[PDB]
Amino acid sequence: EPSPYVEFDRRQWRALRMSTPLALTEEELVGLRGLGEQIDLLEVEEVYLPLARLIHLQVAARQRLFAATAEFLGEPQQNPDRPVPFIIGVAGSVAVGKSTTARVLQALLARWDHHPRVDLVTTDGFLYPNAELQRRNLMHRKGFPESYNRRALMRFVTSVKSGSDYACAPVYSHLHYDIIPGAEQVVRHPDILILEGLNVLQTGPTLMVSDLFDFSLYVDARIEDIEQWYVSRFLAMRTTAFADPESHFHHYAAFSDSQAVVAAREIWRTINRPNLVENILPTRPRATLVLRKDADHSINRLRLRKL
């Protein structure tokens, strides 16, 4: 049975590091690591460094492709001070670590030669504001496809990849649980743009952001493990984020372990699980590379699309 995919284990995958330099300290790793995430410098050596290699190889080859269409159109030859930006999508469930994965990947690629401008944008900024979610009856569907201004997101990525000088994305506060009035993230003709979100890999009756990806990543794990990571991280946040009297979720700080397990389980069951099953997981088959995590957060298997 021939297949579009090839599976790896860490053994096999790490061999494809060749001689890529590790350009990242313990202190820097820390700054990118989210609460509960186990990633260390080893994993970055054996997992993220082959990945960065693969991407370097594909960036050049992906340029050929746009140049051919340029040659065809008889267009001015492509300004080397600004090629067509490489778009990378990073998807997966709440609590699976995908955000850390994208930050880390950003760090690795910013540290190539001649030092490529590598931007990272999360789809948080494209959530509808709370007022607008209330209007659409979606205050309990935050993270579902329809809780996003998908049109604005598509405008953004399309703006960037088409070679615009600058594009703006709004900005989300996790503290306040809402979009920040007046705040903008500004992205200026990067060489690489990484876009990270739950549903970035979605497809539809219209051209979407996944149709612009030159490369995509989906961070995966058994569903019960993710529930565990999610519940655990919720308990943990009682003394970090919820501890802030400003936090929209301050009332959670005073929960008992079991009150907090109960609350976390109910949010998992009513929001995050259904989203993962109905929307996120169906996008996995299209990802260039799946990073499979064992119950301890450790990436031990990988699935690559060779077709």
The least CB distance from residue 159 to its own copies, in Å, is 5
The DSSP annotation for 89-126 comes to: EEEE-TTSSHHHHHHHHHHHHHTSTT---EEEEEGGGG
Among 38, 130, 159, 185, the residue binding its own copies under the rule CB under 8 A is: 159
Beta strand pairing call for 289-293 and 215-221: parallel
Q: Which token pair is 130?
A: 């709370």
Is 197 annotated to bind ligand? no
- DSSP 8-state secondary structure symbol assigned to residue 2: -
Contacts of 102 (CB under 8 A, 6+ apart): 90, 120, 122, 194, 196, 217
| Amino acid present at 27 | E
Single out the residue of 49, 231, 245 nearest to residue 41, CA to CA.
Answer: 49
Nearer to its own copies among residue 90 and residue 304 (C-beta): 304
96 touches ligand GCP (CB under 6 A): yes
| Contact letters for ligand GCP, residues 179-208 (x by CB under 6 A) | ------------------------------
Local structure of 284: helix, strand or coil = helix
Query: Are the CB atoms for 210 and 200 separated by under 8 Å?
Result: yes
Residue 106 binding: pick among ligand GCP, its own copies, none (C-beta 5-8 Å cut-off by kind): none
State the DSSP string of 127-176: BPPHHHHHHHT-TT-BTBGGGB-HHHHHHHHHHHHTT-S-EEEEEEETTT
Interface pattern 220-259 for ligand GCP (x via CB under 6 A): ---------------------x-------x----------
Pick the binder of ligand GCP from 151, 174, 188, 222 (CB under 6 A). 174
Question: Is 98 flagged in the annotation as binding?
Answer: yes
61 is an interface residue for its own copies by CB under 8 A: yes
Please report whether residue 292 would count as binding its own copies according to CB under 8 A.
no
- Report the residue number, 11 or 296, with the smaller CB distance to its own copies: 11
**Tokens 């850390």 sit at which residue?**
100
Q: How far apart are CA 98 and CA 218, in angstroms?
A: 8
Residue 168 interacting with its own copies (CB under 8 A): no
Find the binding residues for its own copies in span 210-239 (CB under 8 A): 211-212
> How many residues lie near ligand GCP (CB under 6 A)?
14
With vertex at residue 26, the alpha carbon angle to CA 23 and CA 27, rounded to the nearest 5 degrees, is 105
Among the listed residues 203, 256, 259, 270, the single contact to its own copies using CB under 8 A: 203
What's the closest the beta carbon of residue 306 comes to its own copies, in angstroms? 6
- Does 9 bind its own copies (CB under 8 A)? Our answer is no
For the chain, the residue count is: 307
Residue ranges that bind ligand GCP, judged by CB under 6 A:
34-35, 37, 94-100, 174-175, 241, 249
Residue ranges that bind its own copies, judged by CB under 8 A:
2-4, 6, 15-16, 50, 53-54, 57-58, 60-62, 64-69, 71-74, 158-159, 161-162, 164, 203-207, 211-212, 282, 285-286, 304, 306-307
Binding-site residue set for ATP: 92-99
